[PDB]
Structures are given as structure tokens and as C-alpha cells.
Amino acid sequence: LPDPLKPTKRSFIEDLLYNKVTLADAGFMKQYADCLGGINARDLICAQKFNGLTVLPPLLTDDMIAAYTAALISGTATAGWTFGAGAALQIPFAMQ
């Protein structure tokens, strides 16, 4: 679960799962200012933008997905198997 005493909205294992897939090589998050400068005009991303090959961003961000996972884990811990059928029913974790 996320730590409320931290600036990040993701947990420790969720932070370790990030910084393991290198997304910088694909150029998913690139500005148009550095492409128009001309100093690094021989990049492999600015040619894709110059030839009309753009990459659209995903709808859901990472913070929303982290909130979804945290909600699912908290519902599993506090309620158990019964929050997927109807309303959430509290039960101690030992009895679950």
C-alpha cells in the first residue's frame, strides 16, 4: 500500500517495478523544443515527428492506476472476497 508520509503516490514494490523498463529509448515523452533547436537534429525521435509519426499518450495516467491498485488491495485486506459481489463487508483478517 502507498505510504502517506511520502511525496510519492506509489508503494515501494511499485517503485521498484518502475526504473526497470527503460522508456527513454522509445522517446514516448519528448518535447518539441529540443527538436527545433537543431543542435540534436540527428535524433531518432525528431525524424519521426518531422515525418508525421507521432505517439498519442495513454488516457489513464500512472497515478490513477496506482490508486486503482491501492483501492483493490485495501478492499481485499479489509473486506476480502465479498466486495466483488455486492457491498463491502468488514471482517478481521485472521478470520478471513
Partner: protein, 48 residues
């Protein structure tokens, strides 16, 4: 998945250097050498 998408986009970018049977792989040295009578049979090869 990331490597495959990046490789596909890089291949699509790099596939612009094939002349496809025309006299050049660029549209600027075809339009600045041949007149409009016989330059239309070279641009269509590039488009197709």
C-alpha cells in the same frame, strides 16, 4: 513490446531511402532535373 514498437517506427522512418526504381530517393532532385512531362512517371513510383 517497447523494443518492437521502437524498431518498427525506426524501420518505417529508414525505409524512405529506397528509390523504388526512380532516378533518386528524394522529391527535390527529381522535380529540379526533369520537366513535368516525364517527372510524373517517377513520382508515381515513389508514391506506390
Amino acid at each position: 513490446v517497447v523494443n518492437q514498437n521502437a524498431q518498427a517506427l525506426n524501420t518505417l522512418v529508414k525505409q524512405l531511402s529506397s528509390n523504388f526504381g526512380a532516378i533518386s530517393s528524394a522529391l527535390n532532385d527529381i522535380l529540379s532535373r526533369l520537366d513535368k512531362v516525364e517527372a510524373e512517371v517517377q513520382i508515381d513510383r515513389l508514391i506506390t
